[PDB]
């Protein structure tokens, strides 16, 4: 079984720590990145339907040093070597002033996390 | 201020209800979708940095009838008329059986929500 | 049949003109936007497999006033009212200087085009 | 300069060959993917504004064995070692039968290509 609880790294400038996952799949944690290091809360859920060994999940990082918001979604895999890996994709939402600037406010990307 | 608390629709087949936003910007809600109607829980945060009148936000929908997870991120705007509108984009993560199908598991899209 | 040839608008600040589509599905055109109006070339293809009435397509806009590149992909639908509509999604790629800034270089969004 | 002309791989199941880039930045090529191997044509542009050593680019793959279309956009970098690398993200558009299934037709992902 791949569990989200624990400490993760993207082997770059990001770590996160995710706490216990409750019976409804809910969890909280902390996202730590270099800008100098800043810490920000995250909240999310992992899928509990069919109690899969490799569940999907999502979370929102509510950045404490920015007006922006990021969401991540992905899946907790057991890789061919037996190691847990989170394969994620993210959307980063910038705060714009006018609704006419909305078009340029969303970036996308990806991250791969392994246990730390 | 554009506040997330309340009931929202995308005029299509989707309604959302969001509860009280606490002082850290955290909220919970339900997402209602005609697949016959199914209700699933959502958990999210709105950005409180600088107390903007039009904050960004994100949330995760933990579908009750699927192994999938969806994340939404966007911004709560006041348009010309003074009406609230949530401009969002999302990532829908499918549950794949093997890490080699990971490439095909992520869909992207958008939704515009208004009150009621 | 929904064809890409002709003039399109997003009913906002964008028009495009697409030329004839050849037997391999290839086409060229021009993307016109307000920054003041700028014109830029586009090149793409529409799917010819199974000769669908509502084909998928993609194109690249090679912006003449920017270091950036946009790609669009979507489908040419006949809507319920009989009108042709292009439903698209796009990725906008910014030029960054270091490969370490790669993460913030891609925006995503959408456009809906109807004949002009 | 990082030039697109040549042969590329993502070390997985994909190779690409791209031909000469003309003076407007336009190129054609072939995209080779193990589904058994299938070859499909690609058409694209690299950005020539300011003659950057690391230009952005986009292209469309018109799959020969599918009703789908994929677009790729990214940037041609020189990494620490002086090796060329294409960092890309893509949109894969499925062909749906009705405009009401449009919401589920777009997948997103990424690929990193190196020479050979
Ligand atoms: Cl900010
Ligand atoms: Cl950030
Ligand atoms: Cl592990
Ligand atoms: Cl922005
Ligand atoms: Cl990324
Ligand atoms: Cl990563
Ligand atoms: Cl309300
Ligand atoms: Cl499912
Ligand atoms: Cl199920
Ligand atoms: Cl779903
Ligand atoms: Cl799938
Ligand atoms: Cl909508
Ligand atoms: Cl630029
Ligand atoms: Cl632009
Ligand atoms: Cl029409
Ligand atoms: Cl940027
Ligand atoms: Cl958009
Ligand atoms: Cl539009
Ligand atoms: Cl080569
Ligand atoms: Cl197909
Ligand atoms: Cl086929
Ligand atoms: Cl395909
Ligand atoms: Cl599909
Ligand atoms: Cl790759």
From Swiss-Prot, chains A, B, C, D:
Sites where the protein binds biotin: 31
Molecular-function GO terms, alphabetical: biotin binding
UniProt keyword list: Biotin, Disulfide bond, Glycoprotein, Secreted, Signal
Tissue spec: Synthesized in hen oviduct and concentrated in egg white (where it represents 0.05% of the total protein).
Occurrences of domain Avidin-like (ranges): 1-116
GO biological process assignments: antibacterial humoral response
Disulphide connectivity of cysteines: 2-76
Superkingdom classification of source: Eukaryota
GO cellular component: a single term: extracellular region
Compartment annotation: Secreted
Role description: The biological function of avidin is not known. Forms a strong non-covalent specific complex with biotin (one molecule of biotin per subunit of avidin).
Similarity comment: Belongs to the avidin/streptavidin family.
Quaternary structure and interacting proteins, as annotated: Homotetramer.
Protein name per the record: Avidin
UniProt organism field: Gallus gallus (Chicken)
Residues of the full protein shown: 27 to 147 of 152
């Amino acid at each position: 079984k791949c569990s989200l609880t624990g400490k993760w790294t993207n082997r770059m400038n990001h770590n996160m720590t995710i706490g216990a996952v409750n019976s409804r799949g809910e969890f909280t944690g902390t996202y730590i990145a270099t800008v100098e290091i800043k810490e920000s809360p995250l909240h999310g859920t992992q899928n509990t339907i069919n109690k899969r060994t490799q569940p999907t999940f999502g979370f929102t990082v509510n950045w404490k040093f920015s007006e922006s918001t990021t969401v991540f979604t992905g899946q907790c895999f057991i890789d061919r070597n037996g190691k847990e890996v989170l394969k994620t994709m993210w959307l980063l939402r910038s705060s714009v002033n006018d609704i006419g600037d909305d078009w340029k406010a969303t970036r996308v990307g990806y991250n791969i996390f392994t246990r730390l």
